[PDB]
């Protein structure tokens, strides 16, 4: 059912809360036993947000392979994403180990380091060219190469060096800096333009490892980004674009990470971005 028509029908009937609870009720429940081991307590930001065992990313080390991160593999769309929490003071070295091992080209950050007067994630990248960062626990060096600051987002070029082999790679950091402290953006224009800049970079393409996407918990804003990208890609691949069912795509993605889309307002915003995004691509 043309999702724009369903959209107006839910708005007029004021039933976003009911639609959102139905998704919550139908969503997959898989074990997360590795996340709950006592040795991993200081590797989780939130007690109620854990990666499933079946889809978790493993660190390549025999000591402790755990990170709060999930592989979202979208079979029909032919896109994969790694969704993860904002790094903690004791997991910044793990974070960059994962980027290195998974062969990612891009990191997408949808939060500010401080929001609502509290820290939402560690300062995990260097702010000045001449002050690089060394992660002694994982043997990596990270240097800021360039920074481009725009009204709604910042793009950074970073150099990651594996100190063990002296290999280097260029990583692109896409930082959406204007998501409001409360609620969702009033217009999906800045977010869709941001999505379009990540795509244009190559960061989402199959010649690279999966893009790493985070916010504070890695389920809410992070969920909105992947859901919008996958829905738009399906609407361009299929003969009948009106067959793309956002609710069904979200439940497929919830097979791989719990809690994607955290509020009925985030669900409404996800609809708005896809609907308004399709008509801009199709030529209009
Ligand atoms: O002007 C818009 C737009 C729209 F299509 C619908 C509603 C409000 C808007 F602001 N966009 C410009 C860049 C393309 C991706 C974002 C959309």
Curated annotation (Swiss-Prot):
One of its GO terms (molecular function) is enzyme binding. Substrate binds at residues 181, 215-221, 262. The active site is at residue 215. There is a cross-link at residues 215-216 (N,N-(cysteine-1,S-diyl)serine (Cys-Ser)). The keyword Zinc-finger does not apply. It catalyses: O-phospho-L-tyrosyl-[protein] + H2O = L-tyrosyl-[protein] + phosphate. The modification N-acetylmethionine is found at residue 1. GO terms for biological process: actin cytoskeleton organization; cellular response to angiotensin; cellular response to fibroblast growth factor stimulus; cellular response to hypoxia; cellular response to nerve growth factor stimulus; cellular response to nitric oxide; cellular response to platelet-derived growth factor stimulus; cellular response to unfolded protein. The modification Cysteine sulfinic acid (-SO2H) is found at residue 215. Belongs to the protein-tyrosine phosphatase family. Non-receptor class 1 subfamily. This is Tyrosine-protein phosphatase non-receptor type 1. The chain holds residues 1 to 284 of 435 of the full protein.
């Amino acid at each position: 059912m043309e999702m724009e028509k369903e959209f107006e029908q839910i708005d007029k009937s004021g039933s976003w809360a009911a639609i959102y609870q139905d998704i919550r009720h139908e969503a997959s429940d898989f074990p997360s036993r590795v996340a709950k081991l006592p040795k991993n307590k200081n590797r989780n930001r939130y007690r109620d947000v854990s990666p499933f065992d079946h889809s978790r990313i493993k660190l390549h080390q025999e000591d402790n392979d755990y990170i709060n991160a999930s592989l979202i593999k979208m079979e029909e769309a032919q896109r994969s994403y790694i969704l993860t929490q904002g790094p903690l003071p004791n997991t910044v070295g793990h974070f960059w180990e994962m980027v290195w091992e998974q062969k990612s080209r891009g990191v997408v950050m949808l939060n500010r380091v401080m929001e609502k007067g509290s820290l939402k994630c560690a300062q995990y990248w260097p702010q000045k060219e001449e002050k690089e960062m060394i992660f002694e626990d994982t043997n990596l060096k990270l240097t800021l190469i360039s920074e481009d600051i725009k009204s709604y987002y910042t793009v950074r070029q970073l150099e990651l060096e594996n100190l063990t082999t002296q290999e280097t790679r260029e990583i692109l950091h896409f930082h959406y800096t204007t998501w409001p402290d409360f609620g969702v953006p009033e217009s999906p224009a800045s977010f869709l333009n941001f999505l379009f800049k990540v795509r244009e970079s190559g960061s989402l393409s199959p010649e690279h490892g999966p893009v790493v996407v985070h916010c504070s918990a890695g389920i809410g804003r992070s969920g909105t980004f992947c859901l919008a990208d996958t829905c738009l890609l399906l609407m361009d691949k299929r003969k009948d674009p009106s067959s793309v069912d956002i609710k069904k795509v979200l439940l497929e993605m919830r097979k791989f990470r719990m809690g994607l889309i955290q509020t009925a307002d985030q669900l409404r915003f996800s609809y708005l971005a896809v609907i308004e995004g399709a008509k801009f691509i199709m030529g209009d």
